Amino acid sequence: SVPSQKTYQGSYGFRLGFLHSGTAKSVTCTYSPALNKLFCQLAKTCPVQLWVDSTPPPGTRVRAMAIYKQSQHMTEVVRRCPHHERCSDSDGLAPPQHLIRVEGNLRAEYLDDRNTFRHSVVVPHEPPEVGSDCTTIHYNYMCYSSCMGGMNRRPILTIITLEDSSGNLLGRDSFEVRVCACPGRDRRTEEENLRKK
Ligand SMILES: [Zn+2]
């Protein structure tokens, strides 16, 4: 009833990486290592790097799923709010209820789990291109953390799982996400709150 969030590099040394985008007021996506928390604007590109020590087999996939971070909300499916699920902003592939989309990957598949009702988006894992040391998935988050009737100010985590062709676990990593109007200011504020604490 609750997806695991335990970090697990597995046999391939799987882990995420994030760009260093800074905290200017204009920044649209920024990652705080101190908080393990991505701050992003609504529906903007969030680059998430996938790092491995060795190449996983053909047919490996990479799944993203959101859960509520607070234990008392963890059994509730994270979904878009009653406004955004009805705003007809379909990309033609993502169901309108799904918070997390993958940008620019026609092989993305969106799952409504028939048992847990949780949403996820999964893409094939690809080896890095020539001259690159990792691959990158571009995610979009389609509601604000503050959306009433949806996340409703509750923090979420994104869990990224590396899976084999059957969906079995090969690796797992995760990060908190805040979807907000001013990620740069919010990252600065939360890092300051962490330093003061
Ligand atoms: Zn919303």
Swiss-Prot record:
Outcome of mutating residue 107 to P: In sporadic cancers; somatic mutation
Consequence recorded when altering residue 45 to S: In sporadic cancers; somatic mutation
Impact upon substituting residue 180 to S: In sporadic cancers; somatic mutation
Effect of residue 133 to V: In sporadic cancers; somatic mutation
Annotated effect of mutating residue 10 to D: In sporadic cancers; somatic mutation
UniProt-reported outcome of changing residue 155 to H: In sporadic cancers; somatic mutation
Annotated consequence of substituting residue 138 to L: In sporadic cancers; somatic mutation
Consequence when changing residue 57 to R: In sporadic cancers; somatic mutation
Name of the protein in question: Cellular tumor antigen p53
Impact reported for residue 31 to G: In a sporadic cancer; somatic mutation; requires 2 nucleotide substitutions
Effect of residue 39 to I: In sporadic cancers; somatic mutation
Phenotype for residue 64 to G: In sporadic cancers; somatic mutation
Effect of residue 50 to R: In sporadic cancers; somatic mutation
Phenotype upon changing residue 156 to V: In sporadic cancers; somatic mutation
Outcome following mutation: residue 31 to N: In sporadic cancers; somatic mutation
Outcome reported for the amino acid change (mutating residue 86 to L): In a familial cancer not matching LFS; germline mutation and in sporadic cancers; somatic mutation
Region (Interaction with DNA): 178-185
